[PDB]
């Protein structure tokens, strides 16, 4: 024969933490903490990631025909790679500012390639074929796609120079390599010179990188090496060459505008046309809940990685139901 | 809790109503159920969404680059990157940790006063023509039915 | 909101109030004169001003130059710097953004207490000299003038 | 406090407790003093120690050294490194000082409410069986012996 | 007879938000973020900045024709430079690692100009004027003032060695440039021989420079490049210079003393006398409030910048007159 | 027959500050901030640290014969040193990248001194005998403990090369010097073949380094000077040497294993066997309290640095005695 006042008790068993008392039942609670992710690689905000293959960023722009796959595409938010990659440095050696180019081949807006110095109709009086068993394509031993090799011509190596003049209205990235053979006989019989010089010219940039010979080690087939280098040119700038030989000349040079510099993920997850705002080296992530936990390394505008065990926020009150 | 209400004097809750969050039980003649509530619910819920959502909808971001990939030569800068990453990770972990558990103390004491409102919403008009005990349920001398037991909801009654 | 009083029990506050935020008027004989309990008013503000300046002054720094200037090879550690600046921007945005909402809610529920204490402070003293009608209003069976309010205005009474 | 009982309803600070500061009790007449419930004071081993522990051991860090070392042509990176350091110092200092300023108000209040209910417990039974005195004092007319302070602490009393 | 207690309720419209309630109407408020900069920019911690105007940091140190304005001001806390004026590298060429040197000159205590090596009668068997360049001020074309050009004299160009002791107890920066001619017959027209021999050596710092020579892009009637370089002399350390040619030798030097860093500011804002606790391109800042709304870049004791909008606290009450 | 109930008020005259008021006298306060450094050096991460004495890096890896201290050393988690070094480098010279290796010698599992090329008949066609007055260990003169002096033999300096294969599985510390002679005649007195090149090659990239004939300033006996260079050899590679003169090889190589980078502590405090979880260049710390104010620079998993006076947290109620 009474009137009471009371509160809600639910069918829900959810433990939460408070600064006062931890781990108690509540009628409503929101998980806040993010412990969940996609498990597949997605496209970040309108634009896709670079579907690479088995080469590398190095393999992509050095142009080993073992990834003749990469040529056509235009734009990507971030590149992909595996830990597996075989083909990058086709003819063994180091790549100049490698990992700096990885910070300037990430953020990609538009790509258009032009054969800057062709095999046919660019260098007369100098042999335009170049073959090494370190750089092979299924039985054949043909060179890269976007760089070409010079040796001497008819027992000789006549004088030369190449002065390109950019006008494409947007910036262009250029690629080349210097030669270092082990054997003196290998050096002498190839470039027919004793002290040869290399001139690389720009309004700011210039390095007189010299070949030098010794007893460099074996990465199968080649005891010698070829080392690759680069520089940038904006509209109205001039890259000038003056060589004697010993040089893998700039051939196909990549044109790109760009402004910012994003990132490059390397993983294994399959490409899906999923529109995701953020990506981990394991999958893709939301942007709803302000903080997440899968990996410290992420790409985009993301919920921030936390070490938390349980950030289950309470949206209800205590539970003593039944009857 | 901080009020002898939730957990306290009101002891346990009810497996009752589907809709509202608070309310009242009665026995007089007909009904013996729990009449939800809107003014206490549709404003305590109203605030909670404003709350929770504000913890969700405020901290923004622009396009950020997290990865760098350093080398065995430039190792000094590897620890610079590393030192930055788990600089923020430490803060974000520790903050989002502390704000939750500290804000779980709000949401719990939010009901702890919000319910106490309704127990003190019964006393503040009709005074002692009802026996005042601990449980949070008072009897009534002149017994009032489904019309005027419904007049408890808003607080419309004859005399003290 | 919480403690019943501000914007809940007492419907609105008074624009007649000048000498403070809290206190008493007087539905008495003689005349009218808007009064305030200077102590609880000069107490709350002290907390408020500690609160305000505690937010401010506890914050300090040291000479920080934030311009960096990197060239066309420094593109990696140019946006590594971005991770520094943006991190710190996003941090301070979020942290402060929650600091306000939170301590602004704490402000009022501290006020809602400061009026409430005063209510139960009066409801303690006189005991059953008076009846209770919801507004802070105390209708009594006792007859009273000045010096009787003035007794209540400084925690004193002849008999309860 | 935030609900105003410690120096709000009870304007004192007596020599009781020693550890366990919240547990109920009533007083009755057995003599003097108060006691815990041994549960609401485990809420002191929770409430407090895991407020502390959360603010303490929830913070975990990684292996690093802010020490870097830079030559003469590295005043760009040094500026950057020692900028990052300065940042995090500022950030933590502010946030720490805040929490120590915030939570301590909260816990100087946390004691305020849970010790208050001890009063609301007796009122829920004794009501008018005990005449009111402003010290936090009740004075019951009837006569009980030195076996009453272990009675309503439990909750059960005879004639409300 | 009644007695009622209530609160304050003014004529405020000024609102604030809370966690559980937004747009709450309030009485008494305080803005904790600082949005407003005074438009101007003055001194920092008392110490006055470095005014330049249309001049740059290149010609101020190098001695540009236009940079005659700045002679005898004591010091600075940070540098005042305009973003646009284009007056930078006069005779074309890449200034050294310089963005670093912008940083170390951005906060400097003791700064007094002295002449390093007099252009007249300080070099036996050597060369004077040589002034020609498209570098001009007031009708006539003048060479630098802080640098000294040594061309050819009559018959030969002798090889040499010279240095500058650091007997100061404050550190000295030395600039030196190296000329790269377009015309291949321009070298012998001034500097004589076929090759370089440009050598610089401190008690640690060591580099051997070479004029790598080819035809260059044409600007204001001067094609080639001059590469200006710098080093800061710690006490005892003496920079040695050896040239068979092409070294543009130091003429003026600076004695400084600096450990900590600062910055430059790229805004067009006016100079006016005052104090400040901080600085933005937009205007000047005061360290007052805990945070500031204006600009992500600052100098000195700034409040920590925020990109937020609303950051004002409530001192007053949730208010209604009920009138 | 009264009911008077209340709350604690013990002996503590302790104080605390809050947002709503300050100077709050408490019942039992607890510090949240570690202010306590044991003013003593410790073992860190279970493992002891290294020793040097006066010597700083250079007086270890090069083995300056002034600290006989260091003969047999096992493994360190981090490095101790002294900010006093009067003897750390014998023959004056610049140490290329002398901070980068200081970052790589911090955390290391293993290190071994081993004769890379055995002093016995590794160099025919070369005269050792090379010592200097700049580093003499009491009485008659000496040179480093870890390197040699490949001075020219009899009346020749022949063409040669000498290799070191990737022997000891894990990493090895490969260094090498370059001799820069004082007089043109002092050059010929030793290294014969003039203007001759010096190169050192690993798998890729051969660093080109040139001898500057320098008559440079005097500081510490025989001031021709020499240039120190270094690298780290992995597995899957080799190192090669070549010289027509001006070359210093080492006589000791250093087998290592590392991945994580710690840092340097410059502290004079004596060394003890403590197992503390946080180490600062002030003393050791009790790593419990989440924020530390001992010293900004912190080696080890440490609390976070703060400029706070204290962080005194409350566990109890308000203390208002007067019995």
First to last CA, chain E: 21
User: What six digits make up the tokens of E1?
Assistant: 């007879």
D55 touching F, CB under 8 A?
A: yes
Contacts of residue D99 in chain B, CB cutoff 8 Å?
98
- Residue to test with chain E: of F19, F216, F218, most E Cβ within 10 A: F216
- What distance in Å separates residue C35's CA from the closest CA in chain E? 10
Query: In this structure, what DSSP letter does residue D74 have?
Result: G
Closest CA to A231 of A202, A271, A267: A202
User: What six digits make up the tokens of D81?
Assistant: 């490194």
H/E element, E26: none
H/E element, F10: none
Do the Cβ atoms of E119 and E222 come closer than 8 Å? no
| Pairing assessment for the beta strands F113-114 and F226-233 based on DSSP bridges | unpaired
Cβ D1–C113 below 8 Å, yes or no? Answer: yes
Provide, for chain C, the percentages of residues in helix, strand and coil under a 3-state DSSP scheme, each rounded to the nearest 5.
45, 10, 45
- Cα distance between residue B112 and residue C2, in whole Å: 10
Do the Cβ atoms of E65 and E90 come closer than 8 Å? yes
Q: For residue B78, which phi and psi values (nearest 5 degrees)?
A: -70, -40
Cβ F22–C50 below 8 Å, yes or no? Answer: yes
β-strand partners of F225 = none
Closest CA to E22 of D38, D148, B57, A177: B57
Do the Cβ atoms of D135 and F50 come closer than 8 Å? no
Chains that touch F (3 or more CB pairs under 8 A): A, B, C, D, E
D104 touching A, CB under 8 A?
A: no
Do the Cβ atoms of B13 and B1 come closer than 8 Å? no
Distance of CA A321 to the CA centre of its chain: 58
| Nearest-5° Cα angle at A58, A57 to A59 | 90
User: What six digits make up the tokens of E246?
Assistant: 């092409």
Contacts of residue C107 in chain E, CB cutoff 8 Å?
313-315
Residue F192, annotated ligand binder?
no
Domains of chain F, each with CATH number or no CATH = 1-41+273-323 (2.10.77.10), 42-272 (3.90.209.20)
Do the Cβ atoms of C21 and C44 come closer than 8 Å? yes
- What distance in Å separates residue D50's CA from the closest CA in chain A? 6
Closest CA to D22 of A21, F269, E246: A21
- Cα distance between residue F13 and residue F29, in whole Å: 10
Exposure string for D2-14, b = 16+ CB within 10 A, e = fewer:
bbbbbebbbebbb
D43 touching A, CB under 8 A?
A: yes
**Backbone conformation region of residue F174, classed left if phi is above 0, alpha if psi is from -120 to 50, else beta:** beta
Give the full edge-to-edge strand order of the sheet including E264-265: E50-53, E79-81, E264-265
Three state DSSP letters for E152-203: CECCECCCCCEECCCCCCCCEEEEEEEEECCCCCCHHHHCCCCCCCEEEECC
Q: For F81-215, list the strands marked E by DSSP.
A: 113-114, 160-165, 171-179, 198-202, 206-209
* PDB experimental method: X-ray
- Cα distance between residue F79 and residue B121, in whole Å: 70
Q: For chain A, what is the largest distance between any 2 Cα atoms, rounded to a whole number of angstroms?
A: 118
β-strand partners of F206 = F201
First to last CA, chain B: 32
Residue showing tokens 């800057």: A116
Length of chain B: 160
- Cα distance between residue E108 and residue E74, in whole Å: 10
Exposure string for E114-148, b = 16+ CB within 10 A, e = fewer:
eebbebeeebeebbeebeebebeeeeeebbbbbbb
F118 touching D, CB under 8 A?
A: no
Q: For chain E, what is the largest distance between any 2 Cα atoms, rounded to a whole number of angstroms?
A: 120
Sign of the torsion formed by the C-alpha atoms of E275, E276, E279 and E285: negative
First to last CA, chain C: 32
Do the Cβ atoms of A57 and A230 come closer than 8 Å? no
Q: How far is CA A225 from CA A90, A178, A182, A183, E254, in A?
A: 10, 9, 8, 12, 47
Sign of the torsion formed by the C-alpha atoms of A66, A69, A72 and A74: negative
Cβ A20–D43 below 8 Å, yes or no? Answer: yes
- Cα distance between residue A199 and residue A201, in whole Å: 6
Closest CA to F258 of F111, F113, F109: F109
- What distance in Å separates residue D114's CA from the closest CA in chain B? 5
- What distance in Å separates residue E157's CA from the closest CA in chain D? 34
| Pairing assessment for the beta strands E312-314 and E29-31 based on DSSP bridges | antiparallel
- Provide DSSP, C37-100: -HHHHHHHHHHHHHHHHHHHHT-----EE------TTTHHHHHHHHHHHHHHHHHHHHHHHHHH
Of E161, E205, E238, the CB nearest to F217: E238
Q: Which residue of F has its CA nearest to D36?
A: F7
- Cα distance between residue E187 and residue E198, in whole Å: 14
Domains of chain B, each with CATH number or no CATH = 1-160 (3.90.20.10)
What residues contact residue E199 under an 8 Å CB cut-off, 6+ apart?
A: E207, E208, E209, E240, E241, E242, E243, F212
Do the Cβ atoms of E319 and E10 come closer than 8 Å? yes
- What distance in Å separates residue D142's CA from the closest CA in chain C? 20
Contacts of residue E201 in chain F, CB cutoff 8 Å?
212, 214, 216
- Cα distance between residue F23 and residue F3, in whole Å: 32
H/E element, F99: none
Q: How far is CA B75 from CA A297, F99, F254, in A?
A: 18, 10, 19
C157 touching E, CB under 8 A?
A: no
Closest CA to F110 of F41, F172, F175: F172
Closest CA to A41 of A79, A75, A10: A79
Contacts of residue A7 in chain B, CB cutoff 8 Å?
6, 10, 13-14, 21-23, 111, 115
Closest CA to A44 of A287, A250, A217: A287
Residue showing tokens 């008009």: B125
- Cα distance between residue B139 and residue B137, in whole Å: 7
- Cα distance between residue C121 and residue A6, in whole Å: 28
Cβ F21–C50 below 8 Å, yes or no? Answer: yes
Q: What 3-state class would DSSP assign to F155?
A: coil
């Amino acid at each position: 024969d009474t009137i009471c006042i009371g509160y809600h008790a639910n069918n829900s068993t959810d433990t939460v933490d408070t600064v006062l008392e931890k781990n108690v039942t509540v009628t409503h609670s929101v998980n806040l903490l993010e412990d969940s992710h996609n498990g597949k690689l997605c496209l970040l905000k309108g634009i896709a990631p670079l579907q690479l293959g088995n080469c590398s960023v190095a393999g992509w722009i050095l142009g080993n025909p073992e990834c003749e796959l990469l040529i056509s595409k235009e734009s990507w938010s971030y590149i992909v790679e595996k830990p597996n990659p075989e083909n990058g440095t086709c003819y063994p050696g180091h790549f100049a500012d490698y990992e700096e180019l990885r910070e300037q081949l990430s953020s990609v807006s538009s790509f258009e390639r032009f054969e800057m110095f062709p095999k046919e109709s660019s260098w007369p009086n100098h042999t335009v074929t170049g073959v090494s068993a370190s750089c092979s394509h299924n039985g054949k031993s043909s060179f890269y796609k976007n760089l070409l090799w010079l040796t001497g011509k008819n027992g000789l190596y006549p004088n030369l120079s190449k002065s390109y003049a950019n006008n494409k209205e947007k910036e262009v990235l250029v690629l080349w390599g210097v030669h270092h053979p082990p054997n003196i006989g290998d050096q002498r019989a190839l470039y027919h010179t004793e002290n040869a010089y290399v001139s690389v010219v720009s309004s700011h940039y210039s390095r007189k990188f010299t070949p030098e010979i010794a007893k460099r080690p074996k990465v199968r087939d080649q005891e010698g090496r070829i080392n690759y280098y680069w520089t940038l040119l904006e509209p109205g700038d001039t890259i000038i060459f003056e060589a004697n030989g010993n040089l893998i000349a700039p051939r196909y040079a990549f044109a790109l505008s760009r402004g910012f510099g994003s990132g490059i993920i390397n993983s294994n997850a399959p490409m899906d046309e999923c529109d995701a705002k953020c990506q981990t080296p394991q999958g893709a992530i939301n942007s709803s809940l302000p903080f997440q936990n899968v990996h410290p390394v992420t790409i985009g505008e993301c919920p921030k990685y936390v070490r938390s065990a349980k950030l289950r926020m309470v949206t209800g009150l205590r539970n003593i139901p039944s009857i | 809790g901080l009020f002898g209400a939730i957990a306290g004097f009101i002891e346990g809750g009810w497996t009752g109503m589907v809709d509202g969050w608070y309310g009242y039980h009665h026995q007089n003649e007909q009904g013996s159920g729990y009449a939800a509530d809107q003014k206490s619910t549709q404003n305590a819920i109203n605030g909670i969404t404003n709350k929770v959502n504000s913890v969700i909808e405020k901290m923004n971001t622009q396009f950020t680059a997290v990865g760098k990939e350093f080398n065995k030569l430039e190792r000094r800068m590897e620890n610079l990157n590393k030192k930055v990453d788990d600089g923020f990770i430490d803060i974000w972990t520790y903050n989002a940790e502390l704000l939750v558990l500290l804000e779980n103390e709000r949401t719990l004491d939010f009901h702890d006063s919000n319910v106490k409102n309704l127990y003190e919403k019964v006393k503040s008009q009709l005074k002692n023509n009802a026996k005042e005990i601990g449980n949070g349920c008072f009897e009534f001398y002149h017994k009032c039915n489904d019309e005027c037991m419904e007049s408890v909801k808003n607080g419309t009654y004859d005399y003290p």
